[PDB]
Design a protein around this ligand. Structure first.
Ligand SMILES: Cn1ccc2c(=O)n(CC3(O)CCN(C(=O)[C@@H]4CCN(Cc5ncc(-c6ccncc6)s5)C[C@H]4c4ccccc4)CC3)cnc21
Length: 326
């Protein structure tokens, strides 16, 4: 069936994030096209990602991630405990964005994960506005006092007020009252939403749907292409600071057919096990991946063994062979 990653020490969320990344087929195919031919076998993160992806594609056995851990140098537990899950992701996708530059596959990472945003400060009684367009690769939703994703987005674009003890330094116009907000211009083909359960681990109930309509949070909607999001992955944690375990649910083909990825054990599971059971109320979601309905089949284009350049094949084929140890 689908194949697992080893629990080889204390990689925490790493295995779950790799598998979500693996099953973002278009990212995978792009990764395979990177030119690692001349990359140092053990310093190179790009090479490491291709190997893991290759193995996840071909291996009958649980897949090892040691060279990967080494390649970006989070060899300890503190590494993972010092960092957020989106920061791991940036380290991996940052290195692959870079390696793809000057190649056919340049810009695939932005193409898949990059959206844009406007942040503004508007003065009540003075004609003065500060607009800042930012990119984003992922979103950090508040959950405390929020029942669902919907309420979270609502809170996200909430218009804060800057008043009295907290007025805005509007510069030439002196301290002024204003309202600062955020708003979405694009939403990317792949939406990575992290749920801010840390503060610890808040176990409060937080609901999320299979289908997520986001048109109503954009500025301009497109009747051609609506912002409807198909739930792809659920990154899950359970436990506390003494003992905790990380796991991920995927329906890799976006067709409602879920599997549970528990390191080296991958198993069929129910929609209920993947979704409602991870609302919390202790084992609950901390990151969810959505894909835009309209890009579903592009992102999740099917992948063959022929999509992997021979040059790369041999290199790994060979590498394995040398394993030969008494
Ligand atoms: C920007 N922002 C704000 C909040 C927030 C946020 O929650 N997320 C999500 C997140 O990134 C996912 C990945 N994370 C983890 O897996 C956490 C790792 C640390 N855990 C505590 C310790 N347990 C043993 C510790 C320990 C200490 C000393 N020696 C040995 C062991 S320290 C809790 C784990 C955790 C799991 C699930 C949910 C929340 C938190 C971090 C959070 C993302 N961005 C956010």
């Amino acid at each position: 069936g689908y194949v697992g990653l080893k629990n080889q020490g204390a990689t925490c969320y790493m295995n779950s994030l790799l598998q979500t990344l693996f099953f973002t087929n278009q990212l995978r195919k792009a990764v395979y096209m990177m030119p690692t031919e001349g990359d140092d076998s053990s310093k190179s993160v790009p090479l490491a990602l291709q190997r893991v992806f290759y193995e996840l594609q071909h291996s009958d056995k649980p897949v090892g991630t040691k060279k990967l851990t080494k390649s970006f140098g989070w060899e300890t537990l503190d590494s993972f405990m010092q960092h957020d899950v989106q920061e791991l992701c940036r380290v991996l996708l940052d290195n692959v964005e870079n390696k793809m530059k000057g190649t056919c596959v340049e810009g695939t990472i932005p193409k898949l994960f990059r959206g844009k945003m406007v942040s503004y400060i508007q003065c009540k009684e003075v004609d003065y506005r500060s607009d800042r367009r930012e990119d984003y690769y992922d979103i950090q939703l508040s959950i405390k006092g929020k029942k669902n994703i919907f309420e979270s987005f609502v809170d996200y674009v909430a218009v804060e007020q800057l008043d009295g003890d907290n007025k805005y330094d509007a510069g030439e116009h002196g301290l002024q009252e204003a309202e600062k907000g955020v708003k979405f211009l694009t939403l990317p083909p792949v939406l990575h939403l992290q749920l801010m359960r840390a503060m610890i681990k808040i176990n409060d109930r937080f609901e999320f749907p299979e289908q997520l309509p986001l048109d109503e949070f954009l500025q301009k909607t497109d009747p051609k292409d609506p912002a409807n999001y198909i739930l792809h992955a659920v990154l899950v944690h359970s436990g506390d600071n003494h003992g905790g375990h990380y796991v991920v649910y995927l329906n890799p083909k976006g067709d409602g057919k879920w599997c549970k990825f528990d390191d080296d054990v991958v198993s069929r599971c129910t929609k209920e096990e993947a979704i409602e059971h991870n609302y919390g109320g202790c084992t609950n979601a901390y990151m969810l991946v959505y894909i835009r309905e309209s890009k579903l089949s592009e992102v999740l284009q099917a992948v063959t063994d022929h999509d992997i350049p021979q040059q790369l094949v041999e290199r790994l084929q060979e590498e394995k062979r040398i394993e030969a140890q008494k």
